[PDB]
Design a protein around this nucleic acid. Structure first.
Lengths: 122, 155, 129, 205, 80, 82
RNA sequence: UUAGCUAGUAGGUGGGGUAACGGCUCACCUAGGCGACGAUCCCUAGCUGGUCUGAGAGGAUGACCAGCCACACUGGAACU
RNA sequence: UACCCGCAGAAGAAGCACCGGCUAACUCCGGCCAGCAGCCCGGUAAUACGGAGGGUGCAAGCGUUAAUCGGAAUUACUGGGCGUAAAGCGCACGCAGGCGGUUUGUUAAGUCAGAUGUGAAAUCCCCGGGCUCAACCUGGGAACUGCAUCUGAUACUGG
């Protein structure tokens, strides 16, 4: 652009839109499980992904993934969600295992801190 | 006793009636370490043969670079098809601040201190071609001094 | 229309050098003659002469060394659309000192190192490497 | 904040003796030095550029027993100082108190030298200094305290150091159990099999 | 010897006062181009001496009204 | 009034006072007019811990500035030592 | 994807008022003033030295520390 | 209290993440399910799932998430483009605006030079000092790339 064209209208920095807008610049958000169900992946993959819908404390209603093998999550369960999408279109948040309603994945021995599993004492 | 360096090995393929025919291309660079550097590019149906062809083509087709105490004479710009390259002389002790292909070229060429940056496409072949074109177009104070028909008091 | 005759002189020099022209001719001017003087005393052109009285015609004799162009690069820095003025402590050096930068200081048109030794800044006319 | 596990594992991984043992034997008689540790030690895979840079940095760190935060701060200060960054880094590494005590001859290994320093058994200019990372300046005098001169550890270390090479920048008297730090070592005085430029490129990427 | 300004009169409809436009040449802080900038000032013009277009020399004084804080010194060029 | 006093800078348990000329209404470490010296109360006697300019101090006292008790003792000791 | 805004409004004379200049206020007169260099309107926001990042130019930011401002349940007002 | 001295005994003190490529680190065992995933595995010998052994990286911490800049020359002033990849208004006239051939004189507005005032302290950076070292504290300096004023220069832009 001509220097005069920039003087009259400067460069407009491209604005980046968040990928986790329901957190509102917070690392975690608390919400209640509205509906717990399963979903089928997309194309290449084939499974039954454990997912849940949760109304957050700021009013946002989002679908959140439940990682790990096995979960005891029912309706009205108040869980803690964090960012991190599932590549399962639509799901953009993860449920923190070991956070105030979601028990840790039982029988974990490796990467326990990622699933809220206490260290097995000898 | 020149140093030889393999920069990139890439597997290309041509399709025929029966199926795909996979061959390998290797891009290398050689240099004596005091101002001579040349790159070679060989395609072959196998990796060691491709590297051998690249080394033979690189041992020939070598250019001369006018170094200045192990660094560039002046900031130079090298350009090939998609890659635009900027190199700048640094002081003693900085090292080679450059990408992979640029690091290989400037290291086998004999350059010890340089601040470099690769713009556009970072394609290894075009990056080394731009680096070579920028280094061979770099002139020394004696060259400009003799080309101006005046002494070298600018040095 | 013709709104930058100095850039036109630089372009004529560049195109005559790329076409292996022996000499280039152009309408003359005081600033053109000063820049041609700076180019000749630095060794980028062989000679220059101004012919004509009512319509002076400036003729620069281009220079070659090995059948190659003596002027590798010549760029207009300060231009009508964007004027570039520099102080003496920030005068530019072309080719890390191997090239020249024609600067128009209050004591006439001179090179960047001459303006530095004279303790002067001014308008950066062009870069000649 | 310390490495307490196996010592020869580090030298086997680095493919080079790191002087992690005193020297009553050859390392070849205590371990397979030419073989990397673990079940897959017989294999040797082609190292990348990042692999070589990381391995050289780890070799230097394990030689001097410095963790990553302190080594990063060492590189920061070396890049801050004037001159070549690599020799500045190696000089900063050699200036440590436990390193000098080991080089002085009062420690069979840098681990027992660090134990001598930390246990308040080493003096600097008559002042008991128990910091292993204490930067020793030229003309400093390093000595064993009166209470620790009776230990056989220092005697065995003195003997083991007499069977070693003598550093040019250390004037040590084994009788008085004291030494003087004359000057910082130049690049030509340290080991020649340490590529400082690899560490500089690793930390400047 | 007193610090002053200079501009052209763009309005004299008011009584005992004029509006002087001080044009200045400023380099753009980003793109380096020298752009024109206009500073319009309500100037006190007693005797109603200045017409539209006069290049006048003004100086700053105490507030004389809600918007007037500059006063006239002399007229340099007179609307022709 | 204008007063000449100390502003307690430094670390915890290791104070370092800056002799400042300040309007007595401001905070201790707040807005001051001019710094006219310092005072290190835990100096090792090997170095200097009292470098307060007496010229500007006397100039300000001549203008009605008040001297705090600690600064008065410091001026007395600086005059005695020098 | 806000283009027209403004009646104490702009200026002048005089009275008053303030510690002080001043439409600060009042009477009268003149008919102006702001605006495409963004007036008006709408949304957001304490400002700065500085902090983070960056080779730099810049981008983001304004917790602690220091300067300035504003507020003191909400709205208004004066007294000393 | 800092600091110092004595006692006893290895005695009271190592975890977290990762190991397909990017990216340092590999084997065994249990079926597109369970599951992993920052971007490109699992349909019955999976270095990618889960467990074990081994190893790698950090270490009183280690990871994940959220947020800013960098890489991103990916808003390109430094430092990008528009025939076919996104991009030349369908074409023209034309006000504001931007720019403007050549010579002389004059001015000194832009520009340049010098000086003065200011640019709070802290912070940043440099040389030292004190805390056993460091963090931290601190002396001095540099810097604060800015603004105003005054005196000159006249090549270029402007009047």
């Amino acid at each position: 652009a001509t220097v005069n064209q920039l003087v009259r209208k400067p460069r407009a920095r491209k604005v980046a839109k968040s990928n986790v807008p329901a957190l509102e610049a917070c690392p975690q958000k608390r919400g209640v499980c509205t509906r717990v169900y399963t979903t089928t992946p997309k194309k290449p993959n084939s499974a039954l992904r454990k997912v849940c819908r949760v109304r957050l404390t700021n009013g946002f209603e989002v679908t959140s993934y439940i990682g790990g093998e096995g979960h005891n999550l029912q309706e009205h369960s108040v869980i803690l969600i964090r960012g991190g999408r599932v590549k399962l279109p639509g799901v953009r948040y993860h449920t923190v295992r070991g956070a105030l309603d979601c028990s840790g994945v039982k029988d974990r021995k490796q990467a326990r801190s990622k699933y809220g599993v206490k260290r097995p004492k000898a | 006793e020149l140093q030889e360096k393999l920069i990139a090995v890439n597997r290309v393929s041509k399709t025929v009636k029966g199926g795909r025919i996979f061959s390998f291309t290797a891009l290398t660079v050689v240099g004596d370490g005091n101002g001579r550097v040349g790159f070679g590019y060989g395609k072959a149906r196998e990796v060691p043969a491709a590297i051998q062809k690249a080394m033979e083509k690189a041992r020939r087709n070598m250019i001369n670079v006018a170094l200045n105490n192990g660094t560039l004479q002046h900031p130079v710009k090298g350009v090939h098809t998609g890659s635009r390259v900027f190199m700048q002389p640094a002081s003693e002790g900085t090292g080679i601040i450059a990408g992979g292909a640029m690091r290989a070229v400037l290291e086998v060429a004999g350059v010890h201190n340089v601040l470099a940056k690769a713009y556009g496409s970072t394609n290894p072949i075009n990056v080394v071609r731009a680096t070579i074109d920028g280094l061979e177009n770099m002139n020394s104070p004696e060259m400009v001094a003799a080309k101006r028909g005046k002494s070298v008091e600018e040095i | 229309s013709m709104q930058d005759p100095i850039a036109d002189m630089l372009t004529r020099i560049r195109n005559g050098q790329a076409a292996n022209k022996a000499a280039v001719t152009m309408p003359s001017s005081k600033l053109k003659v000063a820049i041609a003087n700076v180019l000749k005393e630095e060794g980028f052109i062989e000679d220059f002469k101004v012919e004509g009285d009512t319509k002076p015609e400036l003729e620069l004799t281009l220079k070659y060394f090995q059948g190659k162009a003596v002027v590798e690069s010549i760029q207009r820095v300060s231009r009508p659309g964007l004027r570039i003025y520099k102080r003496k402590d920030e005068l530019p050096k072309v080719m890390a000192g191997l090239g020249i930068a024609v600067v128009s200081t209050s004591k006439g048109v001179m090179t960047d190192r001459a303006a530095r030794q004279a303790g002067l800044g001014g308008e950066i006319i062009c870069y000649v490497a | 904040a310390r490495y307490l596990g196996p010592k020869l594992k580090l030298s086997r991984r680095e493919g080079t003796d790191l002087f992690l043992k005193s020297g009553v034997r050859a390392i070849d008689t205590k371990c397979k030095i030419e073989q990397a540790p673990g079940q897959h030690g017989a294999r040797k895979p082609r190292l990348s550029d990042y692999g070589v840079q990381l391995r050289e940095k780890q070799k230097v760190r394990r030689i001097y027993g410095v963790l990553e935060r302190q080594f990063r701060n060492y590189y920061k200060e070396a890049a801050r100082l004037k001159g070549n960054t690599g020799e500045n880094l190696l000089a900063l590494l050699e200036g440590r108190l436990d390193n000098v005590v080991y080089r002085m001859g009062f420690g069979a290994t840098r681990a027992e030298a660090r134990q001598l320093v930390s246990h308040k058994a080493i003096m600097v200019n008559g002042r008991v200094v128990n910091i292993a990372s204490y930067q020793v300046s030229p003309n400093d005098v390093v000595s064993i305290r009166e209470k620790a001169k009776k230990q056989s550890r220092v005697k065995a270390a003195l003997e083991l150091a007499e069977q070693r090479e003598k550093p040019t920048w250390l004037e040590v008297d084994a009788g008085k159990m004291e030494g003087t730090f004359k000057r910082k070592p130049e690049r030509s005085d340290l080991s020649a099999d340490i590529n400082e430029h690899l560490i500089v490129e690793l930390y400047s990427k | 010897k007193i610090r002053t300004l200079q501009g052209r009169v763009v309005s004299d409809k008011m009584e005992k006062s004029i509006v002087v436009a001080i044009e200045r040449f400023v380099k753009h802080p980003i793109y380096g181009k020298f752009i024109k900038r206009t500073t319009k000032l309500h100037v006190h013009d007693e005797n109603n001496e200045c017409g539209i277009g006069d290049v006048v020399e003004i100086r700053e004084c105490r507030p004389l009204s809600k918007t007037k804080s500059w006063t006239l010194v002399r007229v340099v060029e007179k609307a022709v | 009034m204008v007063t000449i006093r100390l502003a307690r800078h430094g670390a915890k348990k290791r104070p370092f006072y800056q002799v400042v000329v300040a309007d007595s209404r401001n905070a201790r470490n707040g807005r001051f007019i001019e710094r006219v010296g310092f005072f290190n109360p835990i100096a090792s006697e090997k170095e200097e811990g009292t470098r307060l300019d007496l010229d500007r101090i006397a100039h300000w006292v001549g203008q009605g500035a008040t001297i705090s008790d600690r600064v008065a003792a410091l001026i007395k000791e600086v005059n005695k030592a020098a």
